[PDB]
A paper describes a structure:
[name] is a β-pore-forming toxin produced by most Aeromonas bacteria, which has attracted large attention in the field of nanopore sensing due to its narrow and charged pore lumen. Pore-forming toxins (PFTs) are important virulence factors of many pathogenic bacteria, which are secreted in a soluble form and upon host membrane binding, they oligomerize into transmembrane pores undergoing a complex structural reorganization.
We obtained near-atomic resolution (2.2 Å) cryo-EM maps of WT [name] solubilized in either amphipols or SMALP, as well as in LMNG-CHS (2.6 Å). The cryoEM map in SMALPs shows an additional density, not observed with amphipol, which allows to partially model some of the lipids surrounding the β-barrel. Interestingly, just below the YW belt, two polar residues, E237 on one β-strand and Q263 on the opposite strand, interact with each other and are fully embedded at the core of the membrane hydrophobic environment. The high resolution of our structures allowed us to define a strong interaction of E237 with Q263 which is highlighted by the continuous density between the two residues. Carefully looking at the fitted model, such conformation could only be consistent with the formation of a double H-bond produced by a protonated E237, which is consistent with the expected higher pKa of glutamates within the hydrophobic environment of the membrane.
Author numbering:
A (entry chain A): 1 to 14, 25 to 422
B (entry chain B): 160 to 422
Write the structure that this text describes.
């Protein structure tokens, strides 16, 4: 009838229903020794491993219970972190070099999920002695490995990677400056006149210039068969003498398949002047290709992709199949608005009461190992909002530029 | 007197561009020459109703286009044939031959096109119980006109020579005296490789040092030395510009609405 959160279940040896027990059966049965038997509400019994989790009518010396006035355990929302203004790279630098608000929370998440060796060689603690570096368009955070170490595969440290930054602009904050042009090349121009020899103003005039460009491709596969039968004989014919006669019959079959596609870009310009009675107006339209550049600024919310890369500990990890052969793992979370299920921490946390939805990380396992409030506080920090002012520059090559003009009237 | 003293460094200046002040641009008379006719249309708009009518349209349009393509084709073929001799009724000895064959073929194509189009329309308002004549003409012509404006001047600066053995600012610090060519854009930002301000401002991040090492130049010459030199190199430039526009085989047209004639 109501969702059951496994972290709230409490076994005593001095009451859960049959329907409730079935919806989270594998959590209850997992928390049981082989051949053990425990009671449920209303005359029912839940049996442990070795009885394959069977739920049957009966009695028991001990009972599975769920508290009156339980809690949901949602992840709390913290206030935003303000980063001093700069361009995109300066703001990214300030975020990844923050120890208390970024480096440690991220390191603990990797640790709690089961990644091995999340730290450097000059400290015994998680998240300490970490090196930060710039790599291509992203950043890499890893424990320092210049000295020696002691442990199985202690030289194989876990990396934290940060990339794909995005901005949610405040609607009233965006501004831009001068737009400049360079390497201008002419495509085409038109000039002309609109003449009105009537006694009223007229607006029924139109001059339009249009330029289009396109590309295309295709691929074809053809297969076929052929069969032929021929006979040859020799005969004596009148006047001509001995003649060789040959007759040939043949047939063929063929099959073919094709796929393809195309892309088109188009730009057009028009002028439509209103002309006074007994007068004329000149018009002009021009089109150029040009390199375009301009400065800009805005205020926004900063989001990014977080990737964890390393090997998973033998003694236990949170991957739902719980592998024990120390495999190398790579997983990406999106810190920000929802995009998908595999990459959403909030989606997976909130659905921990439905066993059929547990396809990636097991968050019930992390709660049992570390405590509910431990996990809530860590995740609230990992998912904390970030805000900053941004300044920057736009540039692009071979874009379009144009000019449309209506001139002064000349009396007829 | 010196090692390779005859191999001197060159400074090259090109690709000038202008940022016009918005209220400064003017142009003069537009003239035409070598005019060739494409097409004309004439006609009448007739209104025999008791109200003015504006529901009339005459439109003339001219289009031109080019295209290209390339194709690559490959294939295979296999054949088996047998031949035997038999004696058949009435016909006698006959040679009989039977042939079976199969084939396969693969092909790939790429291509593209460009189109230019120009059109003109006239839509007159006609008084009640009256008629109006109209005319449209299209020509190809050479176009020319004078102009003037005030602007900010920007350009591309290219340095070309060999790099000194005793030390240079290229981030890999080569020591084999190689010949070098690098271009900076003096003006608004276009890219990172060509922007002095971008590279200077990011000198605190080692992963961004991909071209010139500006920390090296500071250590060698002093911070204020380098600031004053770069401030002069990047100083803004302004001038008034006069000039002339010309282009061949452009379009020219004329659209006319005439005086009404009572019915």
């Amino acid at each position: 009838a109501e969702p059951v959160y496994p972290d709230q279940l409490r076994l005593f040896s001095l009451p859960v229903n049959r329907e409730e027990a079935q919806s989270v059966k594998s959590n209850i049965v997992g928390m049981m020794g082989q051949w053990q038997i425990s009671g449920l509400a209303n005359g029912w019994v839940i049996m442990g491993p070795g009885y394959n989790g069977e739920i049957k009518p009966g009695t028991a010396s001990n009972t599975w219970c769920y508290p009156t006035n339980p809690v949901t355990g949602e992840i709390p929302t913290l206030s935003a972190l303000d980063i001093p203004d700069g361009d995109e790279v300066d703001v990214q630098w300030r975020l990844v070099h923050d120890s208390a608000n970024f480096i440690k929370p991220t390191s603990y998440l990797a640790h709690y999920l089961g990644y091995a060796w999340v730290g450097g060689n000059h400290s015994q603690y998680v998240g300490e002695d970490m090196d930060v570096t710039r790599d291509g368009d992203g950043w890499v955070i890893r424990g320092n490995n210049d000295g020696g170490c002691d442990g199985y595969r202690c030289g194989d440290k876990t990396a934290i990677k940060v990339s794909n930054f995005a901005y949610n602009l405040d609607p009233d904050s965006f501004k831009h400056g001068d737009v400049t042009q360079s390497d201008r090349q002419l495509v085409k121009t038109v000039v002309g006149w609109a003449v009105n020899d009537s006694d009223t103003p007229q607006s029924g005039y139109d001059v339009t210039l249009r330029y289009d460009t396109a590309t295309n491709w295709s691929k074809t596969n053809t297969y076929g068969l052929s069969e032929k039968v021929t006979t040859k004989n020799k005969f004596k014919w009148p006047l001509v003498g001995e003649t060789e006669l040959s007759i040939e019959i043949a047939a063929n079959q063929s099959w073919a398949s094709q796929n393809g596609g195309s892309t088109t870009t188009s730009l057009s310009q028009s002028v439509r002047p209103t002309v006074p009675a007994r007068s004329k107006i000149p018009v002009k339209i021009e089109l150029y290709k040009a390199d375009i550049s301009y400065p800009y600024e805005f205020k926004a919310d900063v989001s990014y992709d977080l990737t964890l890369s390393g090997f998973l500990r033998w003694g236990g990890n949170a991957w739902y199949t719980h592998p024990d052969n120390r495999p190398n793992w790579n997983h990406t979370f999106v810190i920000g608005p929802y995009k998908d299920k595999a990459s959403s921490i909030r989606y997976q946390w909130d659905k921990r009461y439905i066993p059929g939805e547990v396809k990636w990380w097991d968050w019930n396992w992390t709660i049992q190992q570390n405590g509910l409030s431990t996990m809530q506080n860590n995740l609230a920090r990992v998912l904390r909002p970030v805000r900053a002012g941004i300044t920057g520059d736009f540039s692009a090559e071979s874009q379009f530029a144009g000019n449309i003009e209506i001139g002064a009237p000349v009396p007829l």
